[PDB]
Amino acid sequence: MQKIDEKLQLMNTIAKIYRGSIKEFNNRLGKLMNLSYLDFSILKATSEEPRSMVYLANRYFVTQSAITAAVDKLEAKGLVRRIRDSKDRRIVIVEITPKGRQVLLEANEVLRNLVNEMLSDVENVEELLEGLNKILSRI
Amino acid sequence: MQKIDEKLQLMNTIAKIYRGSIKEFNNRLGKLMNLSYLDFSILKATSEEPRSMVYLANRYFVTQSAITAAVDKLEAKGLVRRIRDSKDRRIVIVEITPKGRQVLLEANEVLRNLVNEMLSDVENVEELLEGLNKILSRI
């Protein structure tokens, strides 16, 4: 286990964390709010400002098909709506609705407490955050 | 963005890293070796010693159905074989084959170089590794 192997192990561990955490995330949000983790991500990004479908797939590393499927349900629930870009009606834009903003607050609370509960004794979060952000940019 | 939010963001980033890296991992191993990332994981674990199906699903956080599907292909390719536990024939054990050990060496090389190439300028790997391992245990 020299350094050459440490980076791959870093990725092996990240893989496990995602698989394990996503199951918990989807279970919690699914049973309490009938939402998925991706649903939460879309609501968060659009709460910032309207986002195109391409922007969403790009930011969350999912296929446009995955984004479209998620948005279909979110829009049906009245949490977001699709509108055309007013400067290029060729682009589909996702805008959050007032109801969506309210649901996001609740979903954020659910996920934040869940993660806080689980990682209560984890220190050096800030440093881990910078390391992970850099890794993501290199991916 | 107080500390209360940092841990959730840590998970949001990990989610992206997995989605992005797994696509690259599966693409690379798939096109070069007709293997998946999970295939690599199973080969690595069994190269250590024969492992039960439950052990594999547990270690890699995937369903037993996912493990079974992967093993079906691996065994068909002659990379592993399923045998009964000699002390409890009720348990299915996965044993790596000589061919499997050879393929693992190649898959390891492919993934190691790929990750090394991508994360070449990432420092503080050891510390990130400890942090991530602790997080995984808490999940």
Automatic annotation (TrEMBL), chains A, B:
Keywords: Coiled coil
Pfam families associated with the record: MarR_2 (PF12802)
Annotated HTH marR-type domain residues: 1-137
Coiled-coil residue spans: 108-135
Any Gene Ontology biological process: response to stress
GO molecular-function terms, A-Z: DNA-binding transcription factor activity
Protein name according to UniProt: Transcriptional regulator, marR family, putative
Organism: Saccharolobus solfataricus (strain ATCC 35092 / DSM 1617 / JCM 11322 / P2)
